[PDB]
Every structure is written in C-alpha cells, then in structure tokens.
Write a protein that binds this ligand. Structure first.
Ligand SMILES: Nc1ncc(-c2cccc3cccnc23)cn1
Ligand SMILES: Nc1ncc(-c2cccc3cccnc23)cn1
Ligand SMILES: [Ca+2]
Ligand SMILES: [Ca+2]
Lengths: 113, 113, 116, 116
C-alpha cells in the first residue's frame, strides 16, 4: 500500500541506499515511528507496511537526503526531505516519489486503484 | 533501451494515454521521426525502439501535454513538452520521466547500466 | 531581508497569494521553537520574516501551509504542508530565498543562497 | 517587459548566470523564425527581450542553452537545452515569466502569466 521511489537529478540515476523513515501522527500531535528502510538499486523501497497496518491518518515520510549527498561527495542544502500527507480510504495504493538535487527537491504522490 | 514515463501532478496519477513522439536529428539539422506511442495505464511507454535502431545522436521526445490536459477538461499553458538530449554509448538504458502540471513541467533522465 | 519565501501555483500559472508560512528553529533541547511567521503577498512573496540580528545560526524549518491554500481554492490537496529544513549561517551570514512551486499532489522547492 | 526569463541552478543554489536564451515565433509557413535572444544577468534574470509592440499573438518557443551553461562549469549535462513552447496573447496581451530550474540530468520550468 505504500512505496517510496527516489531519483537523483545530478547523476541521472536512481537514488540508491537512501534511508527513509515513515511516521504516523499520534493523538498528542507527536510523530510515532511507523516503518523504515533503505532504497534498493532501483531507488525503490517496497515492503514498508501492510494493508492491515496502514490506516487512515497523517503520515510523514522523512528521506535522509543529507546522508545520501554526503556519501556521493556532493554538498547538500537540506537536512532531509519530509513529505507529510493524509491517507484517506475506495481501493488505493500510494507511491511517494522524490527527485533530488543538492539545493532543491520535488515530490509527487501517485495514488492508484 | 528507451522508455518514457509520465506522471500527473494535479490528479496524483500516472498520465495515461499521452501521445509521445521521438525524433532523431538528421544531418541537415531537421528532426526525423524515430518512434512514437501512447502511455499505458501505468503512465509508461515501452517498446519504442530496439538496441540496433537506437544509435548515438541527438533525440527529441515530444510529449503532447496539451491534448492530455484538454481530454481531462483542464486548461493548459504549453503546446507540448519537448525533451532534447544526446545519446552517448558502456551499457545503457534511458528512461525519460516527466511530471506534468498545467503551467509547469519537470523532466529527468534515468540512465542505468 | 535574510530570509525570503516565494510561492507559485502550477495550476493557475500565478503567484500563490495569502499562503501562510511558519518558521521554526531547533532549540538546544532538540525541539522546534517558533521563530517567525507571515503570509505571501499578491506577488507570492513573503518579506520581513526576520532581521540580520535575529537570524542566527541554527537548524530552521520553513512550513508552507499548502493545505489551507488549496482548500481555500476549493480543491482537496494531498500534502499537509511543504516543509523545508536546513542549517543556516554555519559559515557566516547568508541570504536565503526559499521558493516553492505547488500543485495539488506535488510540490517542489529550491533554495537560493547568496553572500551579503 | 512582456516576456521575462529567470534561471536557477539546483546544484549550487544560485542564479544561473550568463545563460543564453533564444526565442522563436512560428511563422505562417509553420517554421520557427527568430524573435529575440539574450543572456541572463548576475541575478539569473533576462529582461528586455521584447516590447509590447513586437510581442504579438503567436506560438513562441523559448530555448534556454542549458548545455553551454553546464559545460562552462565543467560538467557534462544530459539535455541539449530546455525548451518552453506556448501560445501567447490569444485572449489579449499578457505578461509572461518563464522560470527554469536546472540540474545536470533534469530541469523544470514554470510559467507565471499576469494581466497588465
Ligand atoms: N518512477 C518515477 N517517478 C517519478 C518521476 C519523476 C519525474 C519527473 C519529476 C519528478 C518530480 C518529483 C518526483 N518524481 C518525479 C520519475 N520516475
Ligand atoms: N522566482 C522563482 N521562480 C520560480 C522558482 C521555482 C521554485 C520551485 C521550483 C521551480 C521549478 C521550475 C522553475 N522555477 C521553480 C523559484 N523562484
Ligand atoms: Ca558555524
Ligand atoms: Ca486571439
């Protein structure tokens, strides 16, 4: 139900081995750890969660862009990229995609049935 | 060796049934038709060309964004999106990805071995 | 003006007007503290957030209220906000312009950093 | 200033300076004719391309020479250029700002259209 895909605009490649943490907003307005992983050779992170676990609510996907750029020897601006959205329930799969540059990022959601 | 992927930033979906034409630059600096198709339900267009046909040179990928937006009832700015690049030969596959909004588009290249 | 925020609307091809922007700074106890806030003008720009005196080193978060923007236009957006988190002034004072480009299911942001 | 072009560099977090920009207009015989050209300033902006008199209805192409920009910085880019093609002034005169954000393997562009 939730996949994350990361691309690198400088190298023209998938962004490989990028740490990604997902949080869900708790009733006290704090962020509870929900799922995490590292992107694969294709820049994709699958298997984050299951249908039963992914309930409606506010999620944060935190992509560690700074570590990624430093591992490539490139100087970065942002601490990370945080993408915060509401999951709303018919049948739906979410893909959070991000395109990374050192001083800019773009993110889009691909929500399909 | 060449794939095109198109996303819609307004609807949060793949951009389905988008016409795409690819041209290769001829010796007289004109644009020769090379391949074309329409994006699938996943927003992807595969099978454009073969290894033997896709030689080094300057290519143009013309995405008919205006037709796409009009078919969705949304008012567009651009006539189309044209993405022009040089193909250079080790082992390489090219993905041209585009993210569409009515008054903006973004494109990236994903070049892998 | 060491910190300026500019917001554009990719649907309409226009400045994003009356967009709320909240800026936070990480405190020594590792929580986010309020730093400054404002709203974009008719040009989509937000000037006057801070001053050279107030804008010290730190980790800053600029939270752009994209959800309210789209909801006011009658549209149901995907994101809650667009957030930009960065370390500022580590090698001395700089001027930062944070720009954001908004669509209902996407946003982009960029930083332009100049040396006064 | 009915037509302005702004270019930013996503690698350095800076204006893209000294970027060549060529503008063409489709002729009645369906070919591209030269219309105007210039280069971005130290702010990454290009003003003075055209005038209200000259900038009539038509289909325009704005070709930003991104390849030369990156090659001058010692970088081998992917794209030949970034091109923006649009119909202008169809419902009367408008002011257009074409902005582009550049990386070596990517670019984005947006249009801001205002009614004088
Ligand atoms: N699989 C896939 N997903 C998205 C893109 C993508 C393309 C262009 C711009 C972007 C801006 C933000 C996020 N993603 C994109 C390319 N390939
Ligand atoms: N003055 C100005 N205009 C536009 C942007 C801008 C911001 C974010 C993404 C972009 C994508 C393509 C083009 N421009 C942008 C930033 N400053
Ligand atoms: Ca310091
Ligand atoms: Ca007309």
């Amino acid at each position: 139900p939730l996949m994350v895909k990361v691309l690198d605009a400088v190298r023209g490649s998938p962004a490989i081995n990028v740490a990604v943490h997902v949080f869900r907003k708790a009733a006290d307005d704090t962020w509870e750890p929900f799922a995490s992983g590292k992107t694969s050779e294709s820049g994709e992170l699958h298997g984050l969660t299951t249908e039963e676990e992914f309930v409606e609510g506010i999620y944060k996907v935190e992509i560690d862009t700074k570590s990624y750029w430093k591992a490539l020897g490139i100087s970065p601006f942002h601490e990370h990229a945080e993408v915060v959205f509401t999951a709303n329930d018919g049948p739906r799969r979410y893909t959070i995609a991000a395109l990374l540059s050192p001083y800019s990022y773009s993110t889009t959601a691909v929500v399909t049935n």
